[PDB]
Symmetry: C3
Subunit: 274 residues, 3 copies
């Protein structure tokens, strides 16, 4: 059980985001339609963008949504400045039941989008085209870095503040662990989690940096695992959150589509090694 | 009787729009001043625009409003990009008591603004300069096309989906009956009602197209008839609604002023025959 | 005691602004953090700007705020178009305990920012860096000119409407006492109070103009005196309010920082004598 504190002037029902077990982290907002048959496009994108910036993760659930990738794309061009890839606006993310090429990892550690790019998108917009039946594990995960910062104790925090991450894949990227939001100034974390060099601390302290970061980022106050449903529309603040993916035993059938939206104006990657 | 679900962070009182007989359609919002003497300009235009996009029809009632057409015009230039006519920003709509030139129609069927124009305005802004005494009939009418779409049965809907309208006045314009919102993607209707050719269906089906469209567009869930009061300010979503005018027996004295606001950015008419 | 009518869709607690004695004028809004450790930057600037325009004075209290003038500056550049001075973005306003150069005035009469400038800022953004211990008098004051207009009686109002102010410091500036908001049209006052010539009325009426303006501008319905606390962030609508400063006996230690934000787009000063 929990209480609901939101009353909107928009034709929607708002409530705190909670995962399927009822845990309520310190971010996220659930939006549901205020009229029969309401489509996501009926809400003003400028308003949604405001909510995404303060709540960091929006889940629009139960709305009629986009008939195809083209419709989603046109919507996103109205929503903001789409960050285009060689493939266009929409990344297709399709998984088949029990599929699995044996060289992958069983999961995706926490990171942010655009780490190795010339420009960093402010938002991820995910449309769940289809999510039939239920899966075991495999949920998309999100962590609020400001929440993690509130969980850290004095010594954990002191360690984080002197640490820097160096990442390579060739593209290279480096960021202090503790950052400022690149437009809005508030404290955030930028961390790419190992399944990777960490400077500014002693090598003997690497183990403790990772443990403490993980304790706080995966804490129930800071972490949310999303179980997709058909026609969910999720808008994530990529400048504040880190995201990843929960381990799975039985991969379920699922179709997601992702579009990136530029910051205003477009954000030059401050961490890319040029 | 009815319930009121809106609490704003703006200094205003919000409630569901209801016509004078108490019918509450599936759109529309009433705004009333939160302070003695409040003027419409005290509210932020960006916020009003958001509400107009999701509620489709705003009625601001009981506010102090504009002293003259010039004041309204300056306000509208701040509000958004005014769509200018040869006469300037403001169309004067003045009617005299019991006036009536015998070649007109007794009413105005449902249609949208900009049908025959190079660009289509997103909003109509109406200021009621004066509406003394009460009239009989003659109310300005508005229909929510998404509401009408929710009322259609399987067979009505199938018919609508194959139908196209061809309109002439010389300027010509053609639009599918069932459209997508030109910026925000959700399903709408574009229909100019006869007091006119309809393609894609069999001629024997014309009668049923018109009957079913009328049943749904004039349904109490989808239709609102506005009784003007002095200093009302009405903002209508021309991209989602259709509008017209109720038949009158005794034309009452009334002065309205209308300004068109461009879409963002200006919307090239997709239906104009060039 | 008083009632609280605001429920936001933002992660904040809203309530009517009240001074330290519990007087609640006809403007102003108090915002407080909705999460432990929340920083002012977590809220969307576009939303804050909307609230500032309708409530005229926002007090964000209890938020984590800016570590230094540079951080405040970057935030303000995201917030809107900063009006830059030769010193940059931030005016430092530092006072020492019991300090006081014997040629000053004991207080600051009501006026507006930008009177003698080529362009007039829409907003003042004040960050209280530090306000240790409590002061006696010396509070920053704000008056809502629309509230003052609602307090005026028939004869006071008639006098105001024919009066004009002429100000000199060389730079010269002239404005009708009763103005229209330069973007949003609603009635406001533009008045620079004497601790100064007033045209359009008879010299014998100067005394009554000043008395009546003061009665209404300093009335509890129209006037708010702010007691600063560390990390307050205040955003004031300079186009609607007048501001000044309460007399002090014992100047307390205090550090404020002020940034000006241009109107959208920048507002050419309509009252500057060129």
């Amino acid at each position: 059980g929990h209480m609901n504190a939101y009353l909107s002037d928009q034709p929607v029902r708002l409530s705190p985001l909670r995962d399927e077990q009822g845990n309520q982290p310190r971010f996220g907002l659930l939006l549901e339609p205020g009229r029969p048959g309401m489509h996501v496009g009926e809400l003003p994108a400028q308003w949604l963008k405001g909510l995404a910036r303060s709540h960091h993760l929006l889940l629009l659930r139960g709305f009629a949504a986009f008939a195809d990738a083209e419709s989603l794309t046109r919507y996103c061009h109205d929503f903001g400045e789409v960050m285009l890839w060689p493939f266009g606006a929409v990344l297709e993310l399709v998984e088949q039941e029990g599929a699995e090429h044996i060289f992958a990892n069983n999961y995706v550690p926490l990171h942010w989008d655009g780490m190795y790019l010339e420009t960093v998108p402010e938002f991820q917009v995910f449309h769940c085209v289809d999510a039939p039946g239920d899966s075991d594990g495999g949920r998309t995960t999100f962590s609020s870095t400001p929440a993690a910062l509130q969980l850290a104790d004095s010594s954990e925090l002191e360690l984080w503040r002197r640490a820097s991450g160096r990442y390579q894949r060739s593209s290279r990227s480096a960021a202090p662990i503790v950052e400022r939001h690149p437009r809005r100034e508030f404290p955030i974390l930028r961390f790419c989690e190992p399944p990777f060099h960490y400077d500014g601390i002693a090598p003997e302290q690497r183990g403790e940096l990772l443990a403490s970061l993980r304790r706080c980022l995966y804490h129930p106050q800071a972490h949310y695992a999303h179980r997709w449903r058909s026609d969910d529309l999720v808008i994530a603040d990529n400048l504040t959150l880190l995201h990843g993916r929960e381990a799975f035993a039985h991969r379920a059938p699922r179709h997601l589509r992702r579009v990136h939206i530029h910051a205003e104006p477009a954000l030059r990657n401050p961490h890319l090694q040029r």
